[PDB]
Amino acid sequence: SMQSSKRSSRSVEDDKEGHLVCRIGDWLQERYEIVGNLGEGTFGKVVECLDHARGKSQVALKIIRNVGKYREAARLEINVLKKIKEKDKENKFLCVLMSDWFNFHGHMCIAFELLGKNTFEFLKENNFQPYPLPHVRHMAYQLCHALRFLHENQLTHTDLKPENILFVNSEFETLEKSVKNTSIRVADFGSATFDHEHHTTIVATRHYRPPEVILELGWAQPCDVWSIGCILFEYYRGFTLFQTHENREHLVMMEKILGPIPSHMIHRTRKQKYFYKGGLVWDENSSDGRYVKENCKPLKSYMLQDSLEHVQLFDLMRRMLEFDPAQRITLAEALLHPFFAGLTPEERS
Ligand SMILES: CCN1/C(=C/C(C)=O)Sc2ccc(OC)cc21
Ligand SMILES: [Cl-]
């Protein structure tokens, strides 16, 4: 219910978890009026606010717990978001960057422009009926465009997944639900790592994680290209390419679907226990063996239609899913792939 901004903004306390005790109608900075809850987690809470210094426009305000490790992780996210903003003065490269950040009584707070549903939540709301190829194509183009910019500015996202890709507007027609506008933005730069910085060993979410990270061979921009390839497959079929929670099984799935791992990646890994005489150790006859052999087929076998536009998609996905990160297509190269000849002039600009 409605409260005054000066009063609400100074009336403040935390709970035993170091969350800010707040509810709908509370204010921050005599500026942000809380009108809803967007999400929550170990880090803190995300609340929808009206921004009264900007005609009451909607924002997603992330409010971090009064806990040191979450405070410090947010400070890093903020420093990445500042560096991206300073490289993209005018926001041509489709990242969800901050509109504001401040320290509210030990709470790091980060404001973002409020966008629509993420590409996972839209798919779930459609009963996991996949995106039509034209939408996959436009979305593919935008991901390539966004990450290419970051990549050529010595940055790697490391955690691209459908939940971190947002529709500017997720309003839909019923034809299956079909989004009216396929414009997307790339979110969640908390893990993003510059070329010169320490690379944490295990990056990406399981389904989107490339072989060089599983085998601990060193990772860079190509990690994001593998993630994008997995994302395009899931947009196109509506289920993840790699339905697994264990490295050995995951690598076997990669072989069943993409062909053999290059021998020099097997030779270089510390993870020798996954291999015997240079081949993956795997029981074809076990319960998991039977499941993988029935469910994990060559990548081309997942095509829904045979027309050229579908061949072009599957060829680009093959290139984004090359085992050897040195041989994997770059996003600069991907943008020249003939799959993108199919974009409308409107999508292409
Ligand atoms: C909770 C979603 N959410 C965020 C979540 C985290 C963990 O950061 S950041 C964000 C930005 C825009 C938005 O539009 C809808 C939503 C949004
Ligand atoms: Cl080990």
SS3 labels along the chain: CCCCHHHHHHCCCECCCCCECCCCCCEECCCEEEEEEEEEECCEEEEEEEECCCCCEEEEEEEECCCHHHHHHHHHHHHHHHHHHHHCCCCCCCECCEEEEEEECCEEEEEEECCCCEHHHHHHHCCCCCCCHHHHHHHHHHHHHHHHHHHHCCEECCCCCHHHEEECCCCEEECCEEECCCCEEECCCCCCEECCCCCCCCCCCHHHCCHHHHCCCCCCCHHHHHHHHHHHHHHHHCCCCCCCCCHHHHHHHHHHHHCCCCHHHHHHCCCHHHEECCEECCCCCCHHHHHHHHHCCCHHHHCCCCCHHHHHHHHHHHHHCCCCCCCCCCHHHHCCCHHHHHCCHHHHC
| Of residues 238, 228, 290, 225, the one with CA closest to residue 120 | 238
Tell me the longest C-alpha to C-alpha distance in the chain: 72
Q: Among 32, 35, 37, 46, which residue has the most ligand 1 atoms within 8 Å of its CB, making it the best to mutate?
A: 46
Q: What is the DSSP string of 15-44?
A: -TTS-B---TT-EETTTEEEEEEEEEETTE
Burial of 109 (0-12, 13-18, 19+ CB in 10 A): buried
Q: What is the DSSP letter of 168?
A: S
* Residue 327 identity (one-letter amino acid): Q
Q: Say which residue the tokens 């009108």 belong to.
A: 35
The number of helices, as runs of H, and strands, as runs of E, in the chain is 12, 14
Residues annotated within a binding site for ATP: 38-46, 62
Method of structure determination: X-ray
Please tell me the number of the ligand nearest to residue 97's CA.
1
State residue 104 phi and psi, 5-degree precision.
-100, 85
Q: Please name every residue paired with 49 in a beta bridge, in sequence order, or none if there are none.
A: 34, 59
Residues annotated within a binding site: 38-46, 62
Report the alpha-carbon distance of residue 31 to residue 238 in Å, rounded.
Answer: 41
Beta strand 165-167 with 184-186 is antiparallel
* Atom 10 in ligand 1: residue holding the nearest Cα: 60
Q: Among 166, 170, 205, which residue has the most ligand 1 atoms within 8 Å of its CB, making it the best to mutate?
A: 166
Three-class SS of residue 100?
strand
Asked if residue 31 has its Cβ within 6 Å of ligand 1, the reply is no
Residue 105 gets the label, from left (phi > 0), alpha (psi -120 to 50) or beta, of left
Q: Say which residue the tokens 């489709």 belong to.
A: 94
Three-class SS of residue 95?
strand
CB atoms within 10 A of CB 14: 16
| Of residues 297, 147, 149, 154, the one with CA closest to residue 233 | 297
Asked if residue 96 has its Cβ within 6 Å of ligand 1, the reply is yes
Instruction: Kindly provide the b/e burial profile for residues 310-324, where b requires at least 16 CB atoms within 10 angstroms of the residue's own CB.
Output: bebbbbbbebbbbbe
Ligand 1: distance of its center to the CA of 53 in Å?
Answer: 20
* Atom 17 in ligand 1: residue holding the nearest Cα: 60
Q: Residue 144 in contact with residue 100, Cβ under 8 Å? A: no
Asked if residue 74 has its Cβ within 6 Å of ligand 1, the reply is no
Q: How many residues does the chain have?
A: 349
Please tell me the number of the ligand nearest to residue 36's CA.
1
Burial of 162 (0-12, 13-18, 19+ CB in 10 A): buried
Ligand 2: distance of its center to the CA of 234 in Å?
Answer: 30
Domain ranges in the chain are: 1-91+96-114, 92-95+115-349
What is the stated resolution of the deposited model, in angstroms? Answer: 2.0
The atom of ligand 1 lying closest to the CA of 113 is 12
Ligand 2: distance of its center to the CA of 324 in Å?
Answer: 22
Q: Residue 155 in contact with residue 84, Cβ under 8 Å? A: yes
Q: Say which residue the tokens 């560096």 belong to.
A: 83
Report the alpha-carbon distance of residue 340 to residue 171 in Å, rounded.
Answer: 25
Q: Among 37, 38, 40, 157, which residue has the most ligand 1 atoms within 8 Å of its CB, making it the best to mutate?
A: 38
Nearby residues of 191 by Cβ (< 8 Å), 6 or more positions away: 157, 158, 159, 200, 203
Q: Please name every residue paired with 48 in a beta bridge, in sequence order, or none if there are none.
A: 36, 60
Q: Which residues are catalytic?
A: 159
Asked if residue 73 has its Cβ within 6 Å of ligand 1, the reply is no
Tokens matching residue 10: 């100074």
CATH code, 1-91+96-114: 3.30.200.20
Residue 119 gets the label, from left (phi > 0), alpha (psi -120 to 50) or beta, of alpha
Report the alpha-carbon distance of residue 114 to residue 101 in Å, rounded.
Answer: 15
State residue 305 phi and psi, 5-degree precision.
-135, 160
Asked if residue 46 has its Cβ within 6 Å of ligand 1, the reply is yes
| Of residues 292, 304, 312, 299, the one with CA closest to residue 258 | 299
CA distances (Å), origin 256, targets 21, 199, 226, 283: 51, 29, 17, 13
Beta strand 98-104 with 32-41 is unpaired
Q: Residue 50 in contact with residue 35, Cβ under 8 Å? A: yes
Nearby residues of 286 by Cβ (< 8 Å), 6 or more positions away: none
> Interhelix angle for 308-320 vs 222-237, to 10°?
140
Q: Residue 161 in contact with residue 205, Cβ under 8 Å? A: yes
